Amino acid sequence: AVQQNKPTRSKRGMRRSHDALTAVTSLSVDKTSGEKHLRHHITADGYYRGRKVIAK
Amino acid sequence: MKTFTAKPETVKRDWYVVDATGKTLGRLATELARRLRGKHKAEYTPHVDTGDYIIVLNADKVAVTGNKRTDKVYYHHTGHIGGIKQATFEEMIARRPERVIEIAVKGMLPKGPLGRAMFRKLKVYAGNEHNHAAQQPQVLDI
Amino acid sequence: MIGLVGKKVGMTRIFTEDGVSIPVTVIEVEANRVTQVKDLANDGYRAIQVTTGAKKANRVTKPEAGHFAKAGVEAGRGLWEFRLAEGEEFTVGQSISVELFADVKKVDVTGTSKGKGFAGTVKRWNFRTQDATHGNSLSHRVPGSIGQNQTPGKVFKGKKMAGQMGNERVTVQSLDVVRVDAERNLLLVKGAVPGATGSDLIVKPAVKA
RNA sequence: CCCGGCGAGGGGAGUGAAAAAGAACCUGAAACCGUGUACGUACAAGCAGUGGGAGCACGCUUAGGCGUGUGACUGCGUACC
RNA sequence: GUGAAGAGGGAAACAACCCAGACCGCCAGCUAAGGUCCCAAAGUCAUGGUUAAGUGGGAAACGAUGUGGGAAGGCCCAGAC
RNA sequence: GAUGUCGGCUCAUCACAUCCUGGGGCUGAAGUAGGUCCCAAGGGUAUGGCUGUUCGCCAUUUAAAGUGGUACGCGAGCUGG
RNA sequence: GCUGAAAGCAUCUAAGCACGAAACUUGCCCCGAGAUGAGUUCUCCCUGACCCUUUAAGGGUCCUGAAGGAACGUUGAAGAC
Ligand SMILES: C=CC[C@@H]1/C=C/C(=O)NC/C=C/C(C)=C/[C@@H](O)C[C@@H](F)Cc2nc(co2)C(=O)N2CCC[C@@H]2C(=O)O[C@@H]1[C@H](C)COC(=O)Nc1cc2ccccc2cn1
């Protein structure tokens, strides 16, 4: 239920060896606006695959 | 001055070949472990592998005195509760005759990383042919 | 002898004139093409590598394509190996039909069982359920004891616990052969076989006999 | 003056002997948490050190075969009150 | 007598048993108990015997043409067993 | 300056001085069915009535309803008669 | 049990030989080369130009970026993630 000995800095860091994050490998670029966006997502301005999808 | 110590980067390791036919198991493994460790070299160092590579041929023809050919038992456990298995000297010779020499030598070598490396210099074969002629192994009548 | 690779189409019933209904598992066994033949001089054992079905040319990797091209046969959805019983002889490009099971009378079917996921001891090991009432506190389907006291002081290996159940290789032995329709590449065997509809099956003649 | 939400918090400029004295302010120790560099570490079992000891790195050196850090492998070794 | 209040070596490990009483240092030598095929420092030493049971390396009354040695005796080429 | 007990439930694991199945010798073993001893631990080895019970008596089954060790196995798994 | 001496016989045993059980090793099913002893087979891909230097399994620049993989997305009789 509870520990008999105090774990160490080492074991704490070992457990956190799998806690690191992953950065996006690359950002996609739109044909028309040339903006940078997530793949399969729309841009901040509202474009997607150069078709002027929702902007309002 | 300080006593000499061998360097694993400058140590000379020779290659030898041995025929196990008719040889007594224990009295043979003793000389192997002696050479695999380097006790026969004046440059012997306990924390260094100064031994030599040794090839053993015809491991399926070693001899044992008394009724050990049928009464000697090789026990081993698998980790499960049943676990305990056993095989006689005859059964091992028919299934895997090389393990007889390896097991006898493994017990005569030191326990630990170093002794585990010495065992790697031992090449045991069941027949009279080996594929290490490139190393030009010298005959050893031991 | 050797076996064949097929696909599980489903189950149905075959009515006989004697008023009997035979539950059958329909197995589609298309032409099995030999891609490689192994011997002792090169591989150390006798066997044959086969394939079946089809695959998208734009999805077949170059290594796989070169393996099929060396044999001179189209690509398939996988590769499987069969051993030879000291008297069989095959050649690359040779197509094996379901007619090979015409006079066997019994077969062993191997497949990949359905996946149940993380299963409990009641379902996975047929553990007996505790009391649903009479004071039971949060221990209705739990396993109970898993060992003993200060003696060994550990749980023995192989202890039956909860965990993954299914999605593993399973073989059913000695299934009766009901029909062999080479015109339609069908093999009807009496009974159920592992896996879901559309899964791969390895069909070998019965070894028990 | 600048970034920032006419923010918080910072970077400059300026004051001062000193801003690493900037108001969470003299001095600023330890536990504890971090960045960087060197070495070691993914076939090896236990009070974690000690004795021996290769290699690597670095500083010497009027090459002087010394010093510092690391410590593969190895003998012995079950904390304190 | 030892431990307690005593380390070291040996008995695999083992306060009380065996050897032996640590002022400090040495990469010198001789010994004790105990040991000298390998783990593991030192005789695969020498000589003459015993054991075949891994006895050695767990045990009794009792049982048995196991085997070695010794002191006698009985019946026998008037032919024994 | 806390090692929580009977029995039940759940889950078990080992031993063999073996309950069943398997292999044998003797028999005051005709056969059937038994008695006794030797080998053998691979697997298997009841449900219910009464009682908190273990045990036990009873009813009815079974090829058999084995003997024991495991903190008289198992309450950081349940129950609390 | 056969043959058979020690022991002129006898004797399953000492040499030698043949039968013999759900135990043992295999045969059946599953995992399985982290089997660091890291295995085998088939197939596929890459065929630049220089510089620095304690000059070596060395470092660095430009050009090049394959096989294939991962990522993202639509998803699954696969799945806690
Ligand atoms: C309520 C009230 C009951 C009362 C006291 C309770 C309490 O203090 N709980 C605190 C728990 C302390 C624990 C669990 C301490 C552990 O770290 C060690 C433990 F397990 C070790 C352990 N415990 C136990 C045994 O071994 C044992 O018996 N108990 C343990 C449970 C209660 C019971 C217990 O003591 O019951 C008490 C009863 C009055 C006894 O009745 C008797 O007739 N006793 C008895 C019989 C004797 C016959 C012959 C000679 C002499 C005898 C003398 N005494």
Side-chain angles (χ1 to χ4, degrees):
Chain A
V2 79
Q3 63 206 24
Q4 279 200 356
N5 283 282
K6 183 192 179 184
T8 60
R9 298 163 266 272
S10 187
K11 292 285 163 181
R12 179 184 69 208
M14 294 177 174
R15 182 177 59 244
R16 296 175 187 181
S17 63
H18 302 279
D19 289 353
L21 309 178
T22 77
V24 289
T25 64
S26 59
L27 292 303
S28 306
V29 183
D30 187 77
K31 308 163 90 71
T32 297
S33 69
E35 300 166 31
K36 191 176 296 313
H37 70 92
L38 271 177
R39 197 155 189 74
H40 300 105
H41 291 54
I42 67 179
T43 74
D45 288 349
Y47 285 79
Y48 185 64
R49 298 179 66 174
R51 208 177 302 92
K52 187 40 166 185
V53 307
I54 71 98
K56 14 65 177 49
Chain B
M1 61 186 297
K2 285 181 168 182
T3 287
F4 164 86
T5 183
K7 285 72 148 49
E9 310 89 357
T10 82
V11 69
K12 284 298 306 191
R13 300 201 181 88
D14 293 326
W15 275 79
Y16 294 93
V17 61
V18 173
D19 195 338
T21 183
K23 302 286 177 58
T24 301
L25 176 62
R27 309 189 101 83
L28 166 63
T30 303
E31 199 65 18
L32 300 176
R34 167 176 148 85
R35 281 188 149 75
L36 292 168
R37 208 193 180 184
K39 299 186 111 303
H40 66 300
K41 295 228 191 73
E43 307 85 356
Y44 164 74
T45 322
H47 63 95
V48 184
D49 166 56
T50 50
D52 296 328
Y53 300 88
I54 302 167
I55 297 161
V56 185
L57 306 172
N58 299 313
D60 61 336
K61 304 184 185 177
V62 286
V64 282
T65 55
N67 293 285
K68 273 181 284 196
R69 187 165 296 275
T70 63
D71 295 359
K72 207 200 196 312
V73 180
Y74 288 85
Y75 295 102
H76 79 267
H77 204 267
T78 71
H80 293 244
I81 326 93
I84 189 67
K85 318 290 260 292
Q86 57 181 96
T88 54
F89 183 92
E90 261 292 357
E91 293 286 358
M92 299 280 283
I93 290 281
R95 191 214 309 284
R96 212 136 54 92
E98 304 90 353
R99 291 287 294 154
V100 171
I101 309 287
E102 300 177 27
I103 289 160
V105 171
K106 219 197 82 175
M108 299 184 187
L109 290 169
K111 277 59 174 186
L114 188 66
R116 218 145 45 229
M118 297 163 173
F119 176 83
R120 309 199 171 99
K121 309 203 304 306
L122 185 69
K123 314 295 181 176
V124 190
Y125 297 87
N128 208 343
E129 289 290 355
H130 62 72
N131 46 332
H132 304 309
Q135 285 68 44
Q136 293 169 116
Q138 303 303 93
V139 169
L140 180 58
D141 186 307
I142 261 51
Chain C
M1 63 150 60
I2 58 128
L4 295 178
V5 178
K7 182 191 289 181
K8 179 170 172 180
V9 185
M11 303 182 66
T12 179
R13 74 226 79 155
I14 296 283
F15 282 120
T16 55
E17 196 67 9
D18 60 359
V20 178
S21 151
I22 311 174
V24 309
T25 296
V26 185
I27 312 181
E28 190 188 18
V29 188
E30 294 178 352
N32 305 72
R33 294 106 58 186
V34 180
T35 56
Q36 185 184 353
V37 183
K38 311 200 174 187
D39 63 73
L40 310 111
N42 191 38
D43 298 75
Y45 69 101
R46 299 187 60 243
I48 61 172
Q49 183 185 98
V50 304
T51 193
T52 176
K55 208 176 190 180
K56 284 178 163 56
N58 72 84
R59 196 164 278 271
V60 170
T61 65
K62 303 243 290 180
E64 298 173 357
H67 190 71
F68 296 118
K70 186 174 180 170
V73 82
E74 291 73 20
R77 57 183 146 89
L79 292 166
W80 300 264
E81 227 159 308
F82 288 103
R83 303 285 283 265
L84 306 177
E86 194 59 291
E88 328 190 50
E89 200 282 338
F90 293 93
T91 309
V92 298
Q94 188 176 9
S95 295
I96 311 174
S97 66
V98 73
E99 289 287 358
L100 173 130
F101 290 122
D103 301 332
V104 304
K105 229 168 297 319
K106 275 202 179 181
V107 301
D108 301 339
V109 176
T110 299
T112 313
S113 60
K114 281 182 158 179
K116 323 295 194 178
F118 207 116
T121 49
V122 172
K123 183 190 178 65
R124 191 186 176 197
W125 299 116
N126 318 134
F127 274 24
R128 293 152 78 175
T129 276
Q130 293 191 51
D131 276 298
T133 189
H134 289 292
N136 185 284
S137 290
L138 324 176
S139 302
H140 303 294
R141 299 176 117 258
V142 303
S145 179
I146 62 172
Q148 308 89 25
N149 213 320
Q150 192 137 272
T151 326
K154 62 176 187 171
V155 180
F156 292 131
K157 258 180 179 303
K159 184 71 184 71
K160 292 176 180 184
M161 287 179 154
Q164 181 65 23
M165 184 186 179
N167 196 31
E168 56 177 1
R169 182 195 180 93
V170 173
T171 290
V172 180
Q173 295 178 310
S174 303
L175 297 179
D176 296 328
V177 169
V178 182
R179 186 179 298 166
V180 176
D181 199 337
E183 210 73 5
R184 306 175 184 176
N185 301 320
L186 293 179
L187 181 68
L188 313 190
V189 306
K190 178 185 172 187
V193 311
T197 303
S199 55
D200 292 327
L201 299 173
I202 286 82
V203 181
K204 303 199 289 291
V207 56
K208 294 289 187 64

PDB file of all heavy atoms in Angstrom, chain B residues 13-38:
ATOM      1  N   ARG B  13      46.843 -14.293 -27.423  1.00  0.00           N
ATOM      2  CA  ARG B  13      45.977 -15.449 -27.240  1.00  0.00           C
ATOM      3  C   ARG B  13      46.174 -16.393 -28.415  1.00  0.00           C
ATOM      4  O   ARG B  13      45.876 -16.035 -29.559  1.00  0.00           O
ATOM      5  CB  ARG B  13      44.512 -15.029 -27.128  1.00  0.00           C
ATOM      6  CG  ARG B  13      44.224 -14.089 -25.977  1.00  0.00           C
ATOM      7  CD  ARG B  13      42.757 -14.111 -25.606  1.00  0.00           C
ATOM      8  NE  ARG B  13      42.455 -13.203 -24.506  1.00  0.00           N
ATOM      9  CZ  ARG B  13      42.136 -11.920 -24.653  1.00  0.00           C
ATOM     10  NH1 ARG B  13      42.080 -11.375 -25.861  1.00  0.00           N
ATOM     11  NH2 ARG B  13      41.878 -11.178 -23.587  1.00  0.00           N
ATOM     12  N   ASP B  14      46.674 -17.590 -28.132  1.00  0.00           N
ATOM     13  CA  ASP B  14      46.912 -18.587 -29.159  1.00  0.00           C
ATOM     14  C   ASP B  14      45.706 -19.510 -29.298  1.00  0.00           C
ATOM     15  O   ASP B  14      44.807 -19.538 -28.455  1.00  0.00           O
ATOM     16  CB  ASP B  14      48.167 -19.394 -28.835  1.00  0.00           C
ATOM     17  CG  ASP B  14      49.430 -18.561 -28.905  1.00  0.00           C
ATOM     18  OD1 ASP B  14      49.492 -17.646 -29.754  1.00  0.00           O
ATOM     19  OD2 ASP B  14      50.361 -18.821 -28.115  1.00  0.00           O
ATOM     20  N   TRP B  15      45.696 -20.274 -30.385  1.00  0.00           N
ATOM     21  CA  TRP B  15      44.628 -21.215 -30.686  1.00  0.00           C
ATOM     22  C   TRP B  15      45.161 -22.635 -30.582  1.00  0.00           C
ATOM     23  O   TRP B  15      46.232 -22.941 -31.116  1.00  0.00           O
ATOM     24  CB  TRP B  15      44.058 -20.968 -32.082  1.00  0.00           C
ATOM     25  CG  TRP B  15      43.007 -19.914 -32.115  1.00  0.00           C
ATOM     26  CD1 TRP B  15      43.199 -18.567 -32.100  1.00  0.00           C
ATOM     27  CD2 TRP B  15      41.592 -20.117 -32.164  1.00  0.00           C
ATOM     28  NE1 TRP B  15      41.993 -17.917 -32.138  1.00  0.00           N
ATOM     29  CE2 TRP B  15      40.989 -18.846 -32.179  1.00  0.00           C
ATOM     30  CE3 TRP B  15      40.777 -21.249 -32.199  1.00  0.00           C
ATOM     31  CZ2 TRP B  15      39.611 -18.677 -32.227  1.00  0.00           C
ATOM     32  CZ3 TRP B  15      39.410 -21.079 -32.247  1.00  0.00           C
ATOM     33  CH2 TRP B  15      38.840 -19.803 -32.261  1.00  0.00           C
ATOM     34  N   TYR B  16      44.413 -23.493 -29.896  1.00  0.00           N
ATOM     35  CA  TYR B  16      44.776 -24.889 -29.726  1.00  0.00           C
ATOM     36  C   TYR B  16      43.582 -25.767 -30.064  1.00  0.00           C
ATOM     37  O   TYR B  16      42.430 -25.325 -30.048  1.00  0.00           O
ATOM     38  CB  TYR B  16      45.246 -25.180 -28.299  1.00  0.00           C
ATOM     39  CG  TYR B  16      46.539 -24.497 -27.924  1.00  0.00           C
ATOM     40  CD1 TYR B  16      46.537 -23.258 -27.306  1.00  0.00           C
ATOM     41  CD2 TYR B  16      47.761 -25.094 -28.188  1.00  0.00           C
ATOM     42  CE1 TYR B  16      47.715 -22.632 -26.961  1.00  0.00           C
ATOM     43  CE2 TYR B  16      48.944 -24.476 -27.848  1.00  0.00           C
ATOM     44  CZ  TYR B  16      48.916 -23.245 -27.234  1.00  0.00           C
ATOM     45  OH  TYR B  16      50.094 -22.623 -26.892  1.00  0.00           O
ATOM     46  N   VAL B  17      43.873 -27.026 -30.375  1.00  0.00           N
ATOM     47  CA  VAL B  17      42.856 -28.025 -30.676  1.00  0.00           C
ATOM     48  C   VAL B  17      43.153 -29.269 -29.853  1.00  0.00           C
ATOM     49  O   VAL B  17      44.317 -29.631 -29.655  1.00  0.00           O
ATOM     50  CB  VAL B  17      42.810 -28.360 -32.179  1.00  0.00           C
ATOM     51  CG1 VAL B  17      44.134 -28.929 -32.640  1.00  0.00           C
ATOM     52  CG2 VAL B  17      41.687 -29.327 -32.463  1.00  0.00           C
ATOM     53  N   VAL B  18      42.098 -29.922 -29.376  1.00  0.00           N
ATOM     54  CA  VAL B  18      42.222 -31.067 -28.485  1.00  0.00           C
ATOM     55  C   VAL B  18      41.237 -32.142 -28.918  1.00  0.00           C
ATOM     56  O   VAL B  18      40.122 -31.841 -29.353  1.00  0.00           O
ATOM     57  CB  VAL B  18      41.976 -30.668 -27.017  1.00  0.00           C
ATOM     58  CG1 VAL B  18      41.928 -31.894 -26.135  1.00  0.00           C
ATOM     59  CG2 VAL B  18      43.050 -29.717 -26.546  1.00  0.00           C
ATOM     60  N   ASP B  19      41.656 -33.398 -28.795  1.00  0.00           N
ATOM     61  CA  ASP B  19      40.802 -34.548 -29.056  1.00  0.00           C
ATOM     62  C   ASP B  19      40.382 -35.147 -27.721  1.00  0.00           C
ATOM     63  O   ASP B  19      41.235 -35.485 -26.893  1.00  0.00           O
ATOM     64  CB  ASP B  19      41.527 -35.587 -29.910  1.00  0.00           C
ATOM     65  CG  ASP B  19      40.585 -36.614 -30.501  1.00  0.00           C
ATOM     66  OD1 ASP B  19      39.475 -36.790 -29.958  1.00  0.00           O
ATOM     67  OD2 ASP B  19      40.956 -37.250 -31.511  1.00  0.00           O
ATOM     68  N   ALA B  20      39.076 -35.276 -27.516  1.00  0.00           N
ATOM     69  CA  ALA B  20      38.524 -35.727 -26.249  1.00  0.00           C
ATOM     70  C   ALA B  20      38.244 -37.221 -26.214  1.00  0.00           C
ATOM     71  O   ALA B  20      37.768 -37.723 -25.192  1.00  0.00           O
ATOM     72  CB  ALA B  20      37.238 -34.960 -25.941  1.00  0.00           C
ATOM     73  N   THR B  21      38.527 -37.943 -27.294  1.00  0.00           N
ATOM     74  CA  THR B  21      38.244 -39.370 -27.329  1.00  0.00           C
ATOM     75  C   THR B  21      39.056 -40.101 -26.270  1.00  0.00           C
ATOM     76  O   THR B  21      40.276 -39.937 -26.177  1.00  0.00           O
ATOM     77  CB  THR B  21      38.550 -39.937 -28.715  1.00  0.00           C
ATOM     78  OG1 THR B  21      38.199 -41.324 -28.754  1.00  0.00           O
ATOM     79  CG2 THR B  21      40.024 -39.782 -29.051  1.00  0.00           C
ATOM     80  N   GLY B  22      38.369 -40.906 -25.462  1.00  0.00           N
ATOM     81  CA  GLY B  22      39.014 -41.699 -24.439  1.00  0.00           C
ATOM     82  C   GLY B  22      39.508 -40.927 -23.239  1.00  0.00           C
ATOM     83  O   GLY B  22      39.985 -41.548 -22.282  1.00  0.00           O
ATOM     84  N   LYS B  23      39.413 -39.603 -23.250  1.00  0.00           N
ATOM     85  CA  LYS B  23      39.896 -38.801 -22.139  1.00  0.00           C
ATOM     86  C   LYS B  23      38.870 -38.768 -21.015  1.00  0.00           C
ATOM     87  O   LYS B  23      37.659 -38.766 -21.246  1.00  0.00           O
ATOM     88  CB  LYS B  23      40.200 -37.376 -22.597  1.00  0.00           C
ATOM     89  CG  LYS B  23      41.226 -37.283 -23.710  1.00  0.00           C
ATOM     90  CD  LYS B  23      42.626 -37.541 -23.198  1.00  0.00           C
ATOM     91  CE  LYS B  23      43.641 -37.516 -24.327  1.00  0.00           C
ATOM     92  NZ  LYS B  23      43.626 -36.225 -25.065  1.00  0.00           N
ATOM     93  N   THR B  24      39.371 -38.743 -19.784  1.00  0.00           N
ATOM     94  CA  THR B  24      38.498 -38.636 -18.626  1.00  0.00           C
ATOM     95  C   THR B  24      37.923 -37.229 -18.543  1.00  0.00           C
ATOM     96  O   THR B  24      38.651 -36.239 -18.662  1.00  0.00           O
ATOM     97  CB  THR B  24      39.262 -38.982 -17.351  1.00  0.00           C
ATOM     98  OG1 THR B  24      39.787 -40.310 -17.455  1.00  0.00           O
ATOM     99  CG2 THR B  24      38.353 -38.901 -16.146  1.00  0.00           C
ATOM    100  N   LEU B  25      36.609 -37.146 -18.336  1.00  0.00           N
ATOM    101  CA  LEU B  25      35.913 -35.866 -18.401  1.00  0.00           C
ATOM    102  C   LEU B  25      36.530 -34.848 -17.451  1.00  0.00           C
ATOM    103  O   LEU B  25      36.990 -33.781 -17.872  1.00  0.00           O
ATOM    104  CB  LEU B  25      34.434 -36.076 -18.083  1.00  0.00           C
ATOM    105  CG  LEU B  25      33.558 -34.830 -18.003  1.00  0.00           C
ATOM    106  CD1 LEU B  25      33.518 -34.116 -19.332  1.00  0.00           C
ATOM    107  CD2 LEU B  25      32.166 -35.210 -17.562  1.00  0.00           C
ATOM    108  N   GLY B  26      36.545 -35.160 -16.156  1.00  0.00           N
ATOM    109  CA  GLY B  26      36.994 -34.183 -15.177  1.00  0.00           C
ATOM    110  C   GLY B  26      38.466 -33.848 -15.311  1.00  0.00           C
ATOM    111  O   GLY B  26      38.856 -32.683 -15.208  1.00  0.00           O
ATOM    112  N   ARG B  27      39.303 -34.859 -15.539  1.00  0.00           N
ATOM    113  CA  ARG B  27      40.734 -34.618 -15.663  1.00  0.00           C
ATOM    114  C   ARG B  27      41.082 -33.881 -16.947  1.00  0.00           C
ATOM    115  O   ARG B  27      42.193 -33.354 -17.063  1.00  0.00           O
ATOM    116  CB  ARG B  27      41.490 -35.942 -15.588  1.00  0.00           C
ATOM    117  CG  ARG B  27      41.103 -36.793 -14.394  1.00  0.00           C
ATOM    118  CD  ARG B  27      42.022 -37.979 -14.227  1.00  0.00           C
ATOM    119  NE  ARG B  27      43.021 -37.760 -13.185  1.00  0.00           N
ATOM    120  CZ  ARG B  27      42.806 -37.947 -11.889  1.00  0.00           C
ATOM    121  NH1 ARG B  27      41.624 -38.354 -11.456  1.00  0.00           N
ATOM    122  NH2 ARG B  27      43.776 -37.725 -11.018  1.00  0.00           N
ATOM    123  N   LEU B  28      40.162 -33.833 -17.907  1.00  0.00           N
ATOM    124  CA  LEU B  28      40.338 -33.037 -19.114  1.00  0.00           C
ATOM    125  C   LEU B  28      39.856 -31.607 -18.913  1.00  0.00           C
ATOM    126  O   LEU B  28      40.566 -30.654 -19.244  1.00  0.00           O
ATOM    127  CB  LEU B  28      39.589 -33.687 -20.280  1.00  0.00           C
ATOM    128  CG  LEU B  28      39.396 -32.835 -21.535  1.00  0.00           C
ATOM    129  CD1 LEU B  28      40.731 -32.489 -22.155  1.00  0.00           C
ATOM    130  CD2 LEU B  28      38.518 -33.552 -22.533  1.00  0.00           C
ATOM    131  N   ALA B  29      38.647 -31.445 -18.373  1.00  0.00           N
ATOM    132  CA  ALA B  29      38.100 -30.111 -18.164  1.00  0.00           C
ATOM    133  C   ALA B  29      38.990 -29.275 -17.259  1.00  0.00           C
ATOM    134  O   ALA B  29      39.011 -28.045 -17.371  1.00  0.00           O
ATOM    135  CB  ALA B  29      36.697 -30.211 -17.570  1.00  0.00           C
ATOM    136  N   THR B  30      39.729 -29.921 -16.359  1.00  0.00           N
ATOM    137  CA  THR B  30      40.600 -29.184 -15.453  1.00  0.00           C
ATOM    138  C   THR B  30      41.693 -28.453 -16.219  1.00  0.00           C
ATOM    139  O   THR B  30      41.962 -27.273 -15.968  1.00  0.00           O
ATOM    140  CB  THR B  30      41.206 -30.137 -14.426  1.00  0.00           C
ATOM    141  OG1 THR B  30      40.160 -30.810 -13.720  1.00  0.00           O
ATOM    142  CG2 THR B  30      42.042 -29.374 -13.442  1.00  0.00           C
ATOM    143  N   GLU B  31      42.340 -29.141 -17.159  1.00  0.00           N
ATOM    144  CA  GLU B  31      43.394 -28.502 -17.937  1.00  0.00           C
ATOM    145  C   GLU B  31      42.828 -27.419 -18.845  1.00  0.00           C
ATOM    146  O   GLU B  31      43.473 -26.389 -19.069  1.00  0.00           O
ATOM    147  CB  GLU B  31      44.150 -29.547 -18.752  1.00  0.00           C
ATOM    148  CG  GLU B  31      45.511 -29.083 -19.236  1.00  0.00           C
ATOM    149  CD  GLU B  31      46.477 -28.815 -18.098  1.00  0.00           C
ATOM    150  OE1 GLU B  31      46.224 -29.300 -16.976  1.00  0.00           O
ATOM    151  OE2 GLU B  31      47.486 -28.116 -18.326  1.00  0.00           O
ATOM    152  N   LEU B  32      41.625 -27.634 -19.379  1.00  0.00           N
ATOM    153  CA  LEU B  32      40.993 -26.613 -20.207  1.00  0.00           C
ATOM    154  C   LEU B  32      40.755 -25.339 -19.409  1.00  0.00           C
ATOM    155  O   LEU B  32      41.169 -24.248 -19.818  1.00  0.00           O
ATOM    156  CB  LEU B  32      39.679 -27.141 -20.776  1.00  0.00           C
ATOM    157  CG  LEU B  32      39.774 -28.388 -21.649  1.00  0.00           C
ATOM    158  CD1 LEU B  32      38.395 -28.846 -22.062  1.00  0.00           C
ATOM    159  CD2 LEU B  32      40.624 -28.119 -22.866  1.00  0.00           C
ATOM    160  N   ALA B  33      40.083 -25.459 -18.262  1.00  0.00           N
ATOM    161  CA  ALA B  33      39.845 -24.292 -17.424  1.00  0.00           C
ATOM    162  C   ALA B  33      41.157 -23.639 -17.013  1.00  0.00           C
ATOM    163  O   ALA B  33      41.249 -22.411 -16.920  1.00  0.00           O
ATOM    164  CB  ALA B  33      39.036 -24.691 -16.194  1.00  0.00           C
ATOM    165  N   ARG B  34      42.183 -24.451 -16.760  1.00  0.00           N
ATOM    166  CA  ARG B  34      43.492 -23.909 -16.422  1.00  0.00           C
ATOM    167  C   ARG B  34      44.040 -23.054 -17.557  1.00  0.00           C
ATOM    168  O   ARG B  34      44.633 -21.995 -17.317  1.00  0.00           O
ATOM    169  CB  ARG B  34      44.449 -25.054 -16.090  1.00  0.00           C
ATOM    170  CG  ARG B  34      45.909 -24.670 -16.021  1.00  0.00           C
ATOM    171  CD  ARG B  34      46.756 -25.848 -15.584  1.00  0.00           C
ATOM    172  NE  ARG B  34      48.088 -25.816 -16.180  1.00  0.00           N
ATOM    173  CZ  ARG B  34      49.121 -25.148 -15.680  1.00  0.00           C
ATOM    174  NH1 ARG B  34      48.991 -24.444 -14.563  1.00  0.00           N
ATOM    175  NH2 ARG B  34      50.292 -25.182 -16.300  1.00  0.00           N
ATOM    176  N   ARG B  35      43.847 -23.492 -18.800  1.00  0.00           N
ATOM    177  CA  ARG B  35      44.377 -22.754 -19.939  1.00  0.00           C
ATOM    178  C   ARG B  35      43.453 -21.615 -20.351  1.00  0.00           C
ATOM    179  O   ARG B  35      43.926 -20.541 -20.737  1.00  0.00           O
ATOM    180  CB  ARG B  35      44.604 -23.703 -21.113  1.00  0.00           C
ATOM    181  CG  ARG B  35      45.877 -24.510 -20.999  1.00  0.00           C
ATOM    182  CD  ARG B  35      46.161 -25.289 -22.263  1.00  0.00           C
ATOM    183  NE  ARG B  35      47.593 -25.457 -22.481  1.00  0.00           N
ATOM    184  CZ  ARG B  35      48.357 -26.309 -21.808  1.00  0.00           C
ATOM    185  NH1 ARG B  35      47.830 -27.075 -20.863  1.00  0.00           N
ATOM    186  NH2 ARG B  35      49.650 -26.392 -22.077  1.00  0.00           N
ATOM    187  N   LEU B  36      42.140 -21.828 -20.278  1.00  0.00           N
ATOM    188  CA  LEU B  36      41.200 -20.763 -20.599  1.00  0.00           C
ATOM    189  C   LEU B  36      41.354 -19.565 -19.677  1.00  0.00           C
ATOM    190  O   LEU B  36      40.989 -18.449 -20.062  1.00  0.00           O
ATOM    191  CB  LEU B  36      39.767 -21.285 -20.525  1.00  0.00           C
ATOM    192  CG  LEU B  36      39.361 -22.308 -21.582  1.00  0.00           C
ATOM    193  CD1 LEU B  36      38.044 -22.948 -21.211  1.00  0.00           C
ATOM    194  CD2 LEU B  36      39.268 -21.657 -22.940  1.00  0.00           C
ATOM    195  N   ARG B  37      41.879 -19.767 -18.471  1.00  0.00           N
ATOM    196  CA  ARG B  37      42.071 -18.674 -17.530  1.00  0.00           C
ATOM    197  C   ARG B  37      43.442 -18.030 -17.658  1.00  0.00           C
ATOM    198  O   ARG B  37      43.581 -16.830 -17.395  1.00  0.00           O
ATOM    199  CB  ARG B  37      41.878 -19.173 -16.097  1.00  0.00           C
ATOM    200  CG  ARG B  37      41.405 -18.101 -15.147  1.00  0.00           C
ATOM    201  CD  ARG B  37      41.520 -18.522 -13.702  1.00  0.00           C
ATOM    202  NE  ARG B  37      41.065 -17.466 -12.809  1.00  0.00           N
ATOM    203  CZ  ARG B  37      41.124 -17.527 -11.485  1.00  0.00           C
ATOM    204  NH1 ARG B  37      41.619 -18.599 -10.888  1.00  0.00           N
ATOM    205  NH2 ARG B  37      40.687 -16.510 -10.758  1.00  0.00           N
ATOM    206  N   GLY B  38      44.451 -18.795 -18.051  1.00  0.00           N
ATOM    207  CA  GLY B  38      45.792 -18.280 -18.205  1.00  0.00           C
ATOM    208  C   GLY B  38      46.753 -18.631 -17.094  1.00  0.00           C
ATOM    209  O   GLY B  38      47.804 -17.990 -16.990  1.00  0.00           O
TER     210      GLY B  38
END
